[PDB]
Design an enzyme around this catalytic site. Sequence first.
Site, PDB file in Angstrom:
ATOM      1  N   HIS A 139      -1.074   0.841  -0.535  1.00  0.00           N
ATOM      2  CA  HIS A 139      -1.297   1.877  -1.538  1.00  0.00           C
ATOM      3  C   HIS A 139      -0.505   3.130  -1.147  1.00  0.00           C
ATOM      4  CE1 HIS A 139      -3.876   5.391  -2.956  1.00  0.00           C
ATOM      5  NE2 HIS A 139      -3.417   4.855  -4.074  1.00  0.00           N
ATOM      6  N   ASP A 140       0.156   3.749  -2.120  1.00  0.00           N
ATOM      7  CA  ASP A 140       0.964   4.951  -1.876  1.00  0.00           C
ATOM      8  C   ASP A 140       1.814   4.732  -0.627  1.00  0.00           C
ATOM      9  OD1 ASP A 140       1.828   7.469  -2.597  1.00  0.00           O
ATOM     10  OD2 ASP A 140      -0.212   8.286  -2.713  1.00  0.00           O
ATOM     11  N   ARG A 162       5.763   5.698  -5.858  1.00  0.00           N
ATOM     12  CA  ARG A 162       5.542   6.759  -6.841  1.00  0.00           C
ATOM     13  C   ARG A 162       6.759   7.677  -6.810  1.00  0.00           C
ATOM     14  NH1 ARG A 162      -0.007   7.088  -7.276  1.00  0.00           N
ATOM     15  NH2 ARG A 162      -0.943   5.040  -6.851  1.00  0.00           N
ATOM     16  N   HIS A 186       3.895  12.581  -4.154  1.00  0.00           N
ATOM     17  CA  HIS A 186       2.451  12.390  -4.103  1.00  0.00           C
ATOM     18  C   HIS A 186       2.024  13.617  -4.893  1.00  0.00           C
ATOM     19  CE1 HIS A 186      -1.586  11.443  -2.868  1.00  0.00           C
ATOM     20  NE2 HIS A 186      -1.773  12.714  -2.558  1.00  0.00           N
ATOM     21  N   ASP A 188      -5.037   0.850   2.000  1.00  0.00           N
ATOM     22  CA  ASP A 188      -4.534   2.041   2.660  1.00  0.00           C
ATOM     23  C   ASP A 188      -4.460   1.651   4.128  1.00  0.00           C
ATOM     24  OD1 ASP A 188      -4.233   3.915   0.662  1.00  0.00           O
ATOM     25  OD2 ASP A 188      -6.244   4.771   0.910  1.00  0.00           O
TER      26      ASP A 188
END
Lengths: 296, 296
Positions: free
Chosen positions: B32-33, B69, B82, B274
């Site tokens: 994630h991210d 992102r 972010h 994460d």
Amino acid sequence: ASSVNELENWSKWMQPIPDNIPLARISIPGTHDSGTFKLQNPIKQVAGMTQEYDFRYQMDHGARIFDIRGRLTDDNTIVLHHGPLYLYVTLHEFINEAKQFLKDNPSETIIMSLKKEYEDMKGAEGSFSSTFEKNYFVDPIFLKTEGNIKLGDARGKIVLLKRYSGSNESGGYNNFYWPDNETFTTTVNQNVNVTVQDKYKVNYDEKVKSIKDTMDETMNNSEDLNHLYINFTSLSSGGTAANSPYYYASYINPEIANDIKQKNPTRVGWVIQDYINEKWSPLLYQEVIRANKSLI
Amino acid sequence: ASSVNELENWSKWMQPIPDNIPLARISIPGTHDSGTFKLQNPIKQVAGMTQEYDFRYQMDHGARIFDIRGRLTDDNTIVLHHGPLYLYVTLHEFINEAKQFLKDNPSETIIMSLKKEYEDMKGAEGSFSSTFEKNYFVDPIFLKTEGNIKLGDARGKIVLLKRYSGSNESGGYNNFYWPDNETFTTTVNQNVNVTVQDKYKVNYDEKVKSIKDTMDETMNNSEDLNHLYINFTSLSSGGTAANSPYYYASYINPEIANDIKQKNPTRVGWVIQDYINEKWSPLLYQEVIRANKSLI
């Protein structure tokens, strides 16, 4: 009360230690910013918290040293703070928890560090020191003798570790020079010198090195009963933008606990940590307590 | 590609899986991210980061899905963000890392989820989608076919999972309805239905329940090759004040990994987590990969 196996009872681990042993010599677990447990839950959206559980949980796990931070209100009471924020815990609240624990486990002692965390509320009758000593300290549960306090005299009592100035009442460990973010050595009482590692905002590598260096000094002077060693493993590198205490503790707690277990030392000092829980292995506070096998 | 033992090689775990199997059926770990690793170190004092290590580390540990992102700049390039924060990582940077990984491990595929993270910088030639497709997507490394993409056609290529609108070029998975903070079901293509659990800001207990519920559903529809299951284990509940993603992950990752290990399911879906590291036991991504044993 003469078995190293007794050290495994986290609620009564001080039982097997000889009463003539100065508290300073005992390796004792402590909690940093002990009263931050009510706002720790991330949903509270509060930064700087360092404990997930309450005082009794901390005590039942082996902690005997508590880092209490208070603020004087205009109602002549002392409440617990973390900087400018009220922690929804009071000083009376902590003392009552300690009292019950001591009643249930009279073989133990509770060491209470007290520091003025925030400016007194406007309109307070007296000062932080005068209000604490007059409304709280006078309680007979607080040992009023000093010197190199022995476990024997501390059993069933709360031993104050003063971190506030202006004291006018005898008892516990006198307030001493405490520079900011350093490892320092100074005098406490007439027969007690101290070395404290409290580099609370240095980088991770310097922190682990500092914790280990101070433990090394502690071990190299293991039988110097008149030298007190306080080693904070807690770290908060940064301001508030990053609630880093938990991140660091998640690594430091297991690492230092393992370092202690592997060195099998006879003394590690008063180790004050963040986040006492049962999540990591080995458990730091447990390894600290086990370092007292030499005293049995 | 004949032994489940090959699943143990985190850098080539897709090697033993039959080429005819749709990527949707495979249980795949994701991060994630993904690009927040440069600002994750507490020394950077940035909140909300989710990974401690770089893309290659993530890939070498089994992750094949990456949550990228981006934001379009005035220089007509796409950089990682972010929210309004620059991550000091560019889209080209990620693509090159994926290219090297695929070169070294041609048996694998990299699935790149791309979302428009922040509004374009004024002064850009075209749009986010037009710029991405013209300056990045045109590269042969990106598979340009669609449908229920099979591992066989994906090997050695980057498979795009669009999370941005305005696409005008064929390839990968089509952008689809993605409501905020919910568990939902929709369609990608006429060949693929999708269920996504992405409650990123719900209480901890609801999160764990949601992860497990969606995972149970996945297990119950283990042979539905046309249904795609994406399960985000990441949680950031709480204002930016309480940078809690790591706190939650430290509990969720081990908890969900244990749940999978005990149930030994035949499918767990695309599990996006994460903090991929080697700190917890069992390791979530590892258990997710092992859930493909029955496909061999």
